[PDB]
Write a protein that binds this ligand. Sequence first.
Ligand SMILES: CCCCCCCCNc1cc(-c2ccc(OC)cc2)nc(N)n1
Ligand SMILES: CCCCCCCCNc1cc(-c2ccc(OC)cc2)nc(N)n1
Ligand SMILES: CCCCCCCCNc1cc(-c2ccc(OC)cc2)nc(N)n1
Ligand SMILES: CCCCCCCCNc1cc(-c2ccc(OC)cc2)nc(N)n1
Ligand SMILES: CCCCCCCCNc1cc(-c2ccc(OC)cc2)nc(N)n1
Ligand SMILES: *[C@@H]1O[C@H](CO)[C@@H](O)[C@H](O)[C@H]1NC(C)=O
Ligand SMILES: *[C@@H]1O[C@H](CO)[C@@H](O)[C@H](O)[C@H]1NC(C)=O
Ligand SMILES: *[C@@H]1O[C@H](CO)[C@@H](O)[C@H](O)[C@H]1NC(C)=O
Ligand SMILES: *[C@@H]1O[C@H](CO)[C@@H](O)[C@H](O)[C@H]1NC(C)=O
Ligand SMILES: *[C@@H]1O[C@H](CO)[C@@H](O)[C@H](O)[C@H]1NC(C)=O
Lengths: 207, 209, 207, 213, 205
Amino acid sequence: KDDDDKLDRADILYNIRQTSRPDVIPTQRDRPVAVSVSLKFINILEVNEITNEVDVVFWQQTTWSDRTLAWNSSHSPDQVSVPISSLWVPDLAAYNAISKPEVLTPQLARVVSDGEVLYMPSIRQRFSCDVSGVDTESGATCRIKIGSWTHHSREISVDPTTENSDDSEYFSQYSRFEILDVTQKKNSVTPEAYEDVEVSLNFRKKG
Amino acid sequence: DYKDDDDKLDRADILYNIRQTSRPDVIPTQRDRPVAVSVSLKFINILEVNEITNEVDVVFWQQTTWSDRTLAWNSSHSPDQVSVPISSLWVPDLAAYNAISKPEVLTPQLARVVSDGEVLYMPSIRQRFSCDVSGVDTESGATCRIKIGSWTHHSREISVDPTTENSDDSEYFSQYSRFEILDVTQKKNSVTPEAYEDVEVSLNFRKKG
Amino acid sequence: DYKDDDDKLDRADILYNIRQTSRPDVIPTQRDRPVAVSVSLKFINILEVNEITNEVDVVFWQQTTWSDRTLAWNSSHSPDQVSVPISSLWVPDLAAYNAISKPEVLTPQLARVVSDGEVLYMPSIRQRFSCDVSGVDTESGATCRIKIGSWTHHSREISVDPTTENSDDSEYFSQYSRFEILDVTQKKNSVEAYEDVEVSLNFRKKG
Amino acid sequence: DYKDDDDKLDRADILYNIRQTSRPDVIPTQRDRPVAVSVSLKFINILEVNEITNEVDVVFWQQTTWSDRTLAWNSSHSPDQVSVPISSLWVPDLAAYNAISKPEVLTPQLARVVSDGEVLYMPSIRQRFSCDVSGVDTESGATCRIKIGSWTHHSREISVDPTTENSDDSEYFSQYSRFEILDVTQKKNSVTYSCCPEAYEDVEVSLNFRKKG
Amino acid sequence: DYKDDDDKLDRADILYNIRQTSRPDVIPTQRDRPVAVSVSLKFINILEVNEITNEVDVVFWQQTTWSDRTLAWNSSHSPDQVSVPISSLWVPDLAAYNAISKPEVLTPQLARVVSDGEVLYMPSIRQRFSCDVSGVDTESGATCRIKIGSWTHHSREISVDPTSDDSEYFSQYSRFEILDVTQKKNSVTEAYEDVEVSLNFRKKG
Ligand SMILES: CCCCCCCCNc1cc(-c2ccc(OC)cc2)nc(N)n1
Ligand SMILES: CCCCCCCCNc1cc(-c2ccc(OC)cc2)nc(N)n1
Ligand SMILES: CCCCCCCCNc1cc(-c2ccc(OC)cc2)nc(N)n1
Ligand SMILES: CCCCCCCCNc1cc(-c2ccc(OC)cc2)nc(N)n1
Ligand SMILES: CCCCCCCCNc1cc(-c2ccc(OC)cc2)nc(N)n1
Ligand SMILES: *[C@@H]1O[C@H](CO)[C@@H](O)[C@H](O)[C@H]1NC(C)=O
Ligand SMILES: *[C@@H]1O[C@H](CO)[C@@H](O)[C@H](O)[C@H]1NC(C)=O
Ligand SMILES: *[C@@H]1O[C@H](CO)[C@@H](O)[C@H](O)[C@H]1NC(C)=O
Ligand SMILES: *[C@@H]1O[C@H](CO)[C@@H](O)[C@H](O)[C@H]1NC(C)=O
Ligand SMILES: *[C@@H]1O[C@H](CO)[C@@H](O)[C@H](O)[C@H]1NC(C)=O
């Protein structure tokens, strides 16, 4: 489009930085922020069948909308890159995580003109999950829950992205492991409930 | 009230109010009474136990609550609670006497402030400890004791009191651990110029068999 | 010119000028053409190679140049170039897709800004990758392919150019490494599109 | 006095006064005398002793006290002392000469300031050292010597001294450690040099320990 | 003069003067001539050595000095030197060409500034290098060569210059012992000045 007008872009960043409240949930019309999450698996590095611990690399594709960040893009760029400190991101956490997320990519989000925000960092992290079955035909099934840490369902709703296929599409052919199946469903932990996305990852050692 | 809880402007004003009254470095001491801090550990995972060196590597949710009345607001027609970055608030300077590594916070550092002045902060922590691991293979199991207390504030300034005194822990403990939990007991204890209050947390566990 | 290179106050003023003009978070897109970024990997060392898990641990110099002509100045009687802290300038958000650890930067985070608007940033980096190491014992060696692109900017926004392939490397590679380089190959490639430079390192053990 | 310790507005106002007087980067030399810094190490654990490479990994409470009287206030009806983030205070630049890892601080970084201008900062620290490890498995035990002094300030500027209570630390150290401690001594020492024409004061700490059996 | 070293207000004011005139991000070239930086490595310990992978883990005090005359003051009745956080000061962007890990700094990061404009910064560093360890178990030992110079400033802008067996500082408890340390100038190619430090050392026993 006009995507390459430096001044247009600098002005958009300015508008965003002035409207954006990095610490307040972008609720609209008094309804929960609808965040969407999807893990896209990239690698499985170490698996310990005795301790039941896995070390994985995945794209943590996250999206939501903040309509106040929107702008007329008839003759201005349709989207820009924004550093995540200038923005609100949802406070996601892996319930069965046993190491800090190690973010391997630049910490930038895209804000689209309609007001949609997308953050997709590439993350390496260790989890605690059922590893039993990893050396058989039918493999192991390790389950990861990603939800809001401090915000309950009425404040934030965490759903899976429309597309869960291609989940294993960018998975490294040089892993000692192979993905048999991935499912990504809604779930709610528990007076207040926290929504999360349960990722079931069915994988096996390459025989 | 629930009706007005997702009003963004209201949420932003509460954040502003709190950042104005909040003294992150001063204890929220009230009426010349010690700040009463409730600490409760909910164990999530036991990862690496060593029977020789007597060390363990645990993961627990540190449920911490206390009250700052001065952060209170009316809450009838605004949401009662909000998330606040903890750098904006006073949090107690708890430490574990027998920790042998830094606590690794695995969750976003956010507290919840309630309209009545109550502050709730519950990080997930992975930390190593020095404690009694002997008898871990045996049916009745090792009993590792963790002592968590205020680090610079003596007992006339901060009091620590544990909210759940006994349980199985069944709710939160990973079913995929090598270990099982028999009992968790938490007692208010004390150690002394002046006095420091703590919570002795006794984790009774054994290797599954 | 070269004779006024060491004039201290002339340097202070260029820095000041740069800091007043530079927009560290906006792509320096000139004349509605995507920022053309030059990348060259110049291998220094291979530290550890794992044939079981197919991970490799490498030390390289990431030679990176691009142009921001709004940063240019008249050097008739002032220095030709200066060093700027990387926080004062915009920097391409490059990422390695098959990276499995955070890029550990071994050098000072200083760039060079040339009086014509050229920015040169070349950090020394250590980083682990997941790549095909089968054959590293073998005389014809293994070939590890590292794919580096801009993480958030598509092709109309940022374009990657790699020079030169395959000419390096024998110049900077450690003679004391257990490994030796047979060849290096740096090629353009793409995937709206994300341009990237695929680097192919042909190496083998010594015997 | 002690009956006003939980006066919040007093504590807050004392913090205000301290942050206004305090020069975090300037040594608190009163009356052209060196700052008298007291250090004492109180050992909590020994975790890894490497017989091959002569390395120890230890956990100790590094007890540090000094005086800065400009920060002093009246104790007449404000709290005797308060806690302060160390970024608000000057802290002496202690280093261990035989440290081979960075100091890993296990505790909150708050110091205590007393109404008479006394400042105490006691972090729990886990750190690796390079010292003689031979004997660890014998009756007599190994003896590792740790020197802690000021890195940049010479003896005219800062004096480093051991503390009046020097039994410590024997009692605290965990009963669960593989090791046990035979003796601890903390003697004042003073290294001079060809590098620099001035003398750096320090405390030499001698830790005598053996494996249990 | 020493007499007034411990005047606190004199100290605070010197530090105020330094921070007011110091330009942390600009080379203190004087009189159209390159900054002359003094570098000397003082070996303290050698921890891990791998003759197979040719890798070495060392601890050394890095002595670094240079001049910025604009920092000079009149010390007639004030302190001769004071300590300054390096974030208030320009420091040379030195890098080890053959290093394979970040320099882990173990000491507090302060410089000393002398009333005549001399700046001394000497941090203790544990770093790992990629160097020839062949022949370490032998009586003549390995010779490991480390190369340090300005990472972004060519010769025209910064010169580095050397200034032993390091018996003074080296650990008696190291598995290893030092035969000889030599420090010589070298250039690499516009060109960069560096100091080659050659460490010659063997196993003990
Ligand atoms: C059956 C699901 C397995 C996962 C175990 C979760 C049990 C407890 N559920 C919670 C509690 C909180 C929580 C965190 C912090 C608070 O205060 C800051 C309050 C609640 N947050 C989430 N996402 N799940
Ligand atoms: C036996 C001799 C060993 C010498 C081998 C090293 C050759 C590499 N040359 C360089 C390049 C740069 C450099 C760094 C950054 C730039 O732009 C940001 C430009 C050049 N800096 C130095 N000190 N040596
Ligand atoms: C034939 C070899 C394929 C290997 C690489 C596969 C390319 C995958 N696609 C993407 C997506 C994004 C992306 C990143 C962040 C976003 O939002 C913040 C959106 C897209 N960025 C890049 N460079 N490639
Ligand atoms: C295994 C360890 C043996 C090492 C022996 C220790 C010798 C003591 N020498 C010094 C020098 C300096 C010093 C530091 C920086 C300077 O300028 C910035 C000058 C001197 N500071 C102290 N505390 N001890
Ligand atoms: C292996 C575990 C050993 C446990 C022994 C318990 C001894 C209690 N000692 C202290 C000292 C301080 C303390 C810390 C810092 C100070 O000044 C900054 C003052 C006192 N605080 C507490 N809660 N207990
Ligand atoms: C935005 O601005 C254009 C240009 O004037 C205008 O025609 C258009 O109606 C606006 N777009 C929307 C969706 O309102
Ligand atoms: C606000 O709070 C007070 C309680 O102090 C209550 O009387 C009042 O009705 C509430 N009304 C509001 C804010 O509408
Ligand atoms: C650059 O500056 C010099 C010296 O003033 C001048 O002679 C020359 O014409 C200038 N060039 C431009 C493009 O301004
Ligand atoms: C402290 O204030 C009291 C009154 O509470 C006064 O009597 C006393 O003289 C004061 N002391 C100092 C140090 O000024
Ligand atoms: C500063 O130093 C010069 C040295 O010649 C001397 O003339 C002058 O009196 C000094 N100033 C002070 C503070 O006395």
